[PDB]
Amino acid sequence: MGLPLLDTKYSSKPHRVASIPAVNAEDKPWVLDRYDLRDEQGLQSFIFAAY
Amino acid sequence: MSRTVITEVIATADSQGRFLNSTELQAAFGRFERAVPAIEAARALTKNQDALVKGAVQAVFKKFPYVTQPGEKGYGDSNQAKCARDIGYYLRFITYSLVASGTGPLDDYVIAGLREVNRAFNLNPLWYIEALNYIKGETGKLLSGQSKTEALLYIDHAINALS
Amino acid sequence: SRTVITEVIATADSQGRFLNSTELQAAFGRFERAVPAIEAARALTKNQDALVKGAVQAVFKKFPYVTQPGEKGYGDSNQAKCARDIGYYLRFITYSLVASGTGPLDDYVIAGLREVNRAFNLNPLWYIEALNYIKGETGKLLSGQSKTEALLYIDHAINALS
Amino acid sequence: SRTVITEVIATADSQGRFLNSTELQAAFGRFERAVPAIEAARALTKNQDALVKGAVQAVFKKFPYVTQPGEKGYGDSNQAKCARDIGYYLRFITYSLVASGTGPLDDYVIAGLREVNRAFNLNPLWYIEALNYIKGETGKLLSGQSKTEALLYIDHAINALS
Amino acid sequence: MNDVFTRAIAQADLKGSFLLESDLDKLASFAKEGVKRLDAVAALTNNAPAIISDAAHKLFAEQQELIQPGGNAYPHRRMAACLRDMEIILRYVSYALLAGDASVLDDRCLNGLRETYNALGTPTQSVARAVQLMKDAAMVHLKSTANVTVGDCSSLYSEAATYFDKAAASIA
Amino acid sequence: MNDVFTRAIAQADLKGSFLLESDLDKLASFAKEGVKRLDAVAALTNNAPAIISDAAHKLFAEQQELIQPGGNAYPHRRMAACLRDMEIILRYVSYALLAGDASVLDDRCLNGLRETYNALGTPTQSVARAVQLMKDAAMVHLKSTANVTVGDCSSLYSEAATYFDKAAASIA
Amino acid sequence: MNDVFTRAIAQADLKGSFLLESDLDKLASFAKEGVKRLDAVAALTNNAPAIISDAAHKLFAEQQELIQPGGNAYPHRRMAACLRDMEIILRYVSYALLAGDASVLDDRCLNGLRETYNALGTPTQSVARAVQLMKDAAMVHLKSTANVTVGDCSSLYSEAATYFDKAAASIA
Numbered sequence A: 001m002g003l004p005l006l007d008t009k010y011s012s013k014p015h016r017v018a019s020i021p022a023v024n025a026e027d028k029p030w031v032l033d034r035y036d037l038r039d040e041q042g043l044q045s046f047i048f049a050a051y
Numbered sequence B: 001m002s003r004t005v006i007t008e009v010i011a012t013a014d015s016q017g018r019f020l021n022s023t024e025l026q027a028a029f030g031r032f033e034r035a036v037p038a039i040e041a042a043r044a045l046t047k048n049q050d051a052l053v054k055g056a057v058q059a060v061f062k063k064f065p066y067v068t069q070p071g072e073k074g075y076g077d078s079n080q081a082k083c084a085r086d087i088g089y090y091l092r093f094i095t096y097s098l099v100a101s102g103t104g105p106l107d108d109y110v111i112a113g114l115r116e117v118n119r120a121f122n123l124n125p126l127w128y129i130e131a132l133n134y135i136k137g138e139t140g141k142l143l144s145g146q147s148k149t150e151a152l153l154y155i156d157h158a159i160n161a162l163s
Numbered sequence C, D: 001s002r003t004v005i006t007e008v009i010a011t012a013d014s015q016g017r018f019l020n021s022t023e024l025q026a027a028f029g030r031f032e033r034a035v036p037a038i039e040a041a042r043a044l045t046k047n048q049d050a051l052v053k054g055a056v057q058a059v060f061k062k063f064p065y066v067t068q069p070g071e072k073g074y075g076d077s078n079q080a081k082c083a084r085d086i087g088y089y090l091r092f093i094t095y096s097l098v099a100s101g102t103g104p105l106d107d108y109v110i111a112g113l114r115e116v117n118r119a120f121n122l123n124p125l126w127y128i129e130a131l132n133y134i135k136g137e138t139g140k141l142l143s144g145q146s147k148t149e150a151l152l153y154i155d156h157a158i159n160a161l162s
Numbered sequence E, F, G: 001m002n003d004v005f006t007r008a009i010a011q012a013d014l015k016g017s018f019l020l021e022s023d024l025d026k027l028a029s030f031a032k033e034g035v036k037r038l039d040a041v042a043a044l045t046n047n048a049p050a051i052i053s054d055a056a057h058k059l060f061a062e063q064q065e066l067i068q069p070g071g072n073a074y075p076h077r078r079m080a081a082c083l084r085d086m087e088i089i090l091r092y093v094s095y096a097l098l099a100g101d102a103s104v105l106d107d108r109c110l111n112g113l114r115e116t117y118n119a120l121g122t123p124t125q126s127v128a129r130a131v132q133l134m135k136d137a138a139m140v141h142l143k144s145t146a147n148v149t150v151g152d153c154s155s156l157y158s159e160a161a162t163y164f165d166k167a168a169a170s171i172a
């Protein structure tokens, strides 16, 4: 490590305030998770999405 | 950006995205009580800063005779001045921490970056350890009661982090 | 004023002749001595306020009675004049350091010193004490030839006071 | 591109550390190998046109069908593009020799090889045959360590294609 | 995030000097009235839904153009966003009131909020009017004397008004 | 990140041609003098703390205003940051000295450092002075004839000086 | 009498202030250049009889009326006084060159010299002309490179010229 970092000095952004569902569901990014890893084609899609 | 009681309260409330619950107000009120002996200790310490600084320099010399002879760090009038200045810095930030009722001033001004700077300039931490122990001994006499303990907490914190 | 170049030129002037090797060698020595001298002057200028405050406090430490009421140190105006005089002495010492001659001191401070002190009942030992403090401190602010230059001028001023 | 020195520097920089002894020994190993490698590059540059045309004719012999009309190898434009491609491969092999690292090849030829060859329906086997011809003629054209280095880089290209 | 003590300390350190007698007196006075400050903070905190609802009611009573179709508070998506923003601003004002300085309100909340509102199409003077309505609705609960030792808190009222007005001015 | 070999390769590729015989001769000469180059980079690496301490001592003797309260290197964090920046720049200069090309130094260290210091309120002239002091301290160690075979390393000295100069010029 | 240092001290005293850092820098530059100043002054001193003789020859070839009966340099006595005055003026110019200040020239040499020459019947235009011829001969000697280490001394040349033409302006 070393020295502490400076202050973050935040700014107003959508992610900071996201209590409410986003406007469009199809425009919500796909939240890919571990249960995608069990299939084969699902695993290929997960790998492509990571890349 | 100091890490004090009120700042910790507000930061932990904002991180959780919620108003200030009653416990946080409880801690804030504890800090507000606590401020009075802290301000008393800060006053009785800033008032007698010059005696403390001189005594600390002399105590370091007494505990470390070898720094004084030529070819050492302590030999030199300018090095004497920097002795006094460094100990005055430590005392000033102890008083700041007393006022702020936290370690925020010490961590932010002295403790953060201590070891790299000491290594780069080859300053021995034991010198300041001795000076702060002298200041502790004296503030035993200057203060009494709750203020004495409150000052000793921050002097001890500085000594612990110098180690 | 009265400085090495000026003594050279004045001697040549009064003898009705040019500047010869002896006088140019004096001037040479002045031009090389200028380096520690200007350094001393700059250091003293940077620390003028600390030196003046310390000198006033040393004066009050060595002569406690003067601060007592009915005496020359009682009151704010008297101490303002304290600091003003010490600043005067410091300024003219820096002048003399830059000029490489005692001419600034002799013309601005020493000429008329005794009569003025005697008239206003000022004590020369006060200013000797202040200049001793400045000497001790410039022992720390300066080193090498800078310090010996500063000490020569401060000691000239002290000897003038005594 | 990527060489021995650049690998050293990148590895040091990713841990934020100075170059220690291991990196300098690797660099010295590179600097001592540079002489045979630059000799091999000089020899391969001297033999531009012979090697390129020989490789093209070798490809034509091993794949006689491709020169037939209605195939890839028919027509002056396609044969010119063949010569150009083999020239590219040889140029980048000499670049790798000079750099003493497979960076020139890996960055210019290999990265994107399958996608481009599949899009344009280019066969890796044509280039494998051409590079095997180049490998064969290298043994005649180079002797000693230079031949070893050139064969190493041509082998890397062949392994990449296949 | 700096409370009053921390800025007093930072200003002392920039000058490189200890804290003077008078400055310590001021900080001790602040700490003494900290109980009143805590009561004000609790008055804002406990009554927050009432303040938000009251200000929203008044704002949509004066400016109906928000809640008609084509208005900027029309669907439940946008109305709930309005109420969320108002709660955020009230929360940050409570933080600033407890701390004693508008530093937190400066950095965590109002950093670039006008630009966001302009990009979304929100009317900024409408948001400022909403914050002003929140201030007017929250002074009522601040001045409430139920279950509280009665005394003078006019300095705290002015301080809270300053924080609300500062948020409103920054947004507008 | 390019060394001299990769720079020559890239120019040759842009021209679309093999490397000329003169370019091969220059690269062969570079490889031959690489042993002295490795000695120089080792001298920089193995004396980094000494170089930084010497440069720091000179710099803060010369420029006392930094170490004063309100100066840019006052608290321990800023002093530590000063020393850390000096070590970073020395590290990248050693990288460049090994590679023989200042592309690494410009790309990874100096590309946006002046605006970073301006954003941080740092006297860039002082940083350039610090880099020059590091140059002097490093040239004292590079020219150390003891413990190494004696030879002509004037070219290496000039390259190291050019990298230090280019760092200082790019910062300030 | 004044040199450059003593004038600087005089204005500083008039303000009542110390000498600023820029003034100290100018005086440091002066004292650094002092050795070149000494060379210039020694060139004026060493070659003085040659300068005076050359100026006299040129002046009395130009203005033959001065050496005819009824001229103002006619009898031996007036010619001796003429040459004496030229020597005196050159000598005070050398003084001013060493001092860096034209104060001694004004106070001693040119204090009332125009009224002196007007009362004597001496042509002040011709005296100024003699000063110009002396200036030319002086520049011939001062630009000489033999027996000095080569260097830039143009400031000294211009300053010597200003002393000469200031004398000539005061006379005529």
Ligand SMILES: CCC1=C(C)/C(=C/C2=NC(=C\c3[nH]c(/C=C4\NC(=O)[C@H](C)[C@H]4CC)c(C)c3CCC(=O)O)/C(CCC(=O)O)=C2C)NC1=O
Pocket (backbone or CB within 6 Å): B057, B060, B064, B067, B073, B074, B075, B079, B080, B082, B083, B084, B086, B087, B089, B090, B109, B110, B117, B121, B123, B127, B128, B131, F057, F060, F061, F067, F073, F074, F075, F076, F079
């Ligand atoms: C925020 C608070 C703060 C601290 C504490 C601090 C410590 C500090 N002390 C310094 C000098 C120094 N300080 C000392 C202190 C020693 N002298 C000996 O007689 C004693 C045993 C001992 C003191 C009692 C010495 C010897 C030096 C000179 C080191 C050197 O120049 O190599 C320096 C180098 C800066 C310079 O002189 O240009 C630092 C950074 N700096 C800070 O900004």
Ligand SMILES: CCC1=C(C)/C(=C/C2=NC(=C\c3[nH]c(/C=C4\NC(=O)[C@H](C)[C@H]4CC)c(C)c3CCC(=O)O)/C(CCC(=O)O)=C2C)NC1=O
Pocket (backbone or CB within 6 Å): C056, C059, C066, C072, C073, C074, C078, C079, C081, C082, C083, C085, C088, C089, C108, C109, C116, C120, C122, C126, C127, C130
């Ligand atoms: C150019 C150089 C220069 C000097 C040095 C100088 C000294 C000086 N200081 C004076 C005032 C004074 N100076 C002092 C002395 C100080 N006060 C005491 O407490 C201390 C012990 C002491 C500090 C060392 C006092 C007491 C006075 C007021 C004297 C009076 O008005 O009766 C006066 C009387 C005129 C006035 O009212 O200002 C002179 C002439 N004047 C000059 O023009």
Ligand SMILES: CCC1=C(C)/C(=C/C2=NC(=C\c3[nH]c(/C=C4\NC(=O)[C@H](C)[C@H]4CC)c(C)c3CCC(=O)O)/C(CCC(=O)O)=C2C)NC1=O
Pocket (backbone or CB within 6 Å): D059, D066, D072, D073, D074, D078, D079, D081, D082, D083, D085, D088, D089, D108, D109, D116, D120, D122, D126, D127, D130
């Ligand atoms: C980085 C170095 C690099 C390489 C190696 C490279 C190969 C390459 N060769 C190409 C064309 C081609 N190259 C060939 C080569 C064939 N001709 C004969 O038949 C032989 C059997 C065979 C060669 C051994 C042919 C036929 C084409 C035309 C492909 C088409 O247009 O369908 C193309 C398509 C671009 C174009 O239309 O010119 C590429 C990308 N490109 C590069 O930038």
Ligand SMILES: CCC1=C(C)/C(=C/C2=NC(=C\c3[nH]c(/C=C4\NC(=O)[C@H](C)[C@H]4CC)c(C)c3CCC(=O)O)/C(CCC(=O)O)=C2C)NC1=O
Pocket (backbone or CB within 6 Å): A011, A012, A013, A014, A015, A016, A017, E066, E072, E073, E077, E078, E079, E081, E082, E083, E085, E086, E088, E089, E108, E109, E110, E113, E116, E120, E122, E123, E126, E127, E130, E131
């Ligand atoms: C933690 C500090 C913080 C704040 C305060 C903040 C405000 C904020 N409010 C937003 C949306 C919004 N804000 C509002 C509220 C306004 N419009 C109506 O006219 C009302 C009168 C008025 C409320 C008083 C509305 C309607 C939206 C949604 C706009 C849209 O969906 O197009 C957005 C954009 C993200 C989103 O689409 O949900 C931000 C960043 N962000 C932050 O990070």
Ligand SMILES: CCC1=C(C)/C(=C/C2=NC(=C\c3[nH]c(/C=C4\NC(=O)[C@H](C)[C@H]4CC)c(C)c3CCC(=O)O)/C(CCC(=O)O)=C2C)NC1=O
Pocket (backbone or CB within 6 Å): B022, B025, B026, B029, E035, E036, E038, E039, E040, E042, E142, E143, E144, E145, E148, E149, E150, E151, E152, E153, E156
């Ligand atoms: C659990 C969290 C917590 C709270 C809420 C808190 C507030 C608090 N306020 C107090 C007194 C007080 N509180 C107030 C504040 C009032 N001044 C005006 O009347 C307003 C209606 C109102 C604030 C705007 C005043 C004036 C006092 C008496 C102190 C004085 O001024 O002498 C007391 C002492 C009285 C008692 O305990 O019976 C507490 C504990 N302290 C806490 O640890």
Ligand SMILES: CCC1=C(C)/C(=C/C2=NC(=C\c3[nH]c(/C=C4\NC(=O)[C@H](C)[C@H]4CC)c(C)c3CCC(=O)O)/C(CCC(=O)O)=C2C)NC1=O
Pocket (backbone or CB within 6 Å): A003, A004, A005, A006, F066, F072, F073, F077, F078, F079, F081, F082, F083, F085, F086, F088, F089, F108, F109, F110, F113, F116, F120, F122, F123, F126, F127, F130
């Ligand atoms: C790889 C290229 C690179 C470099 C070198 C770099 C330097 C750098 N210096 C910084 C601050 C700093 N830099 C300095 C150094 C200056 N102050 C002193 O006066 C000296 C004159 C001088 C050093 C010789 C200081 C004191 C800070 C701290 C400022 C602060 O803490 O607010 C910071 C950000 C704050 C932090 O987290 O510490 C960076 C990123 N960044 C990069 O991407």
Ligand SMILES: CCC1=C(C)/C(=C/C2=NC(=C\c3[nH]c(/C=C4\NC(=O)[C@H](C)[C@H]4CC)c(C)c3CCC(=O)O)/C(CCC(=O)O)=C2C)NC1=O
Pocket (backbone or CB within 6 Å): D021, D024, D025, D028, F032, F035, F036, F038, F039, F040, F042, F142, F143, F144, F145, F148, F149, F150, F151, F152, F153, F156
């Ligand atoms: C593991 C890392 C490593 C090191 C440490 C290393 C040092 C090293 N230096 C050498 C010679 C040398 N070393 C130097 C360098 C010195 N010349 C001047 O004295 C300078 C002060 C100084 C460099 C700045 C020179 C000029 C030679 C002769 C090179 C030659 O013979 O061509 C040699 C070859 C032995 C010989 O020629 O007799 C080696 C192996 N090589 C390495 O791979």
Ligand SMILES: CCC1=C(C)/C(=C/C2=NC(=C\c3[nH]c(/C=C4\NC(=O)[C@H](C)[C@H]4CC)c(C)c3CCC(=O)O)/C(CCC(=O)O)=C2C)NC1=O
Pocket (backbone or CB within 6 Å): G057, G060, G061, G067, G073, G074, G075, G076, G079
């Ligand atoms: C009051 C009476 C008076 C006398 C006596 C006098 C002597 C005299 N002769 C002069 C010219 C001269 N006169 C001579 C003399 C002669 N040349 C040679 O043919 C002979 C060997 C030699 C005489 C035996 C010389 C050599 C000069 C040259 C001065 C010059 O070149 O400037 C000059 C210089 C003025 C000029 O340039 O003409 C003077 C002062 N001047 C007077 O006003």
Ligand SMILES: CCC1=C(C)/C(=C/C2=NC(=C\c3[nH]c(/C=C4\NC(=O)[C@H](C)[C@H]4CC)c(C)c3CCC(=O)O)/C(CCC(=O)O)=C2C)NC1=O
Pocket (backbone or CB within 6 Å): C021, C024, C025, C028, G032, G033, G035, G036, G038, G039, G040, G042, G043, G142, G143, G144, G145, G148, G149, G150, G151, G152, G153, G156
């Ligand atoms: C006893 C009387 C005395 C004299 C005469 C004297 C002159 C003197 N001239 C010097 C060099 C020099 N002298 C000159 C001036 C000359 N260069 C150009 O040719 C100009 C035509 C001309 C100026 C009028 C210069 C430029 C230097 C080099 C040193 C420097 O530039 O700082 C030096 C320094 C050492 C050296 O380089 O020789 C001295 C001490 N010092 C004395 O104590």
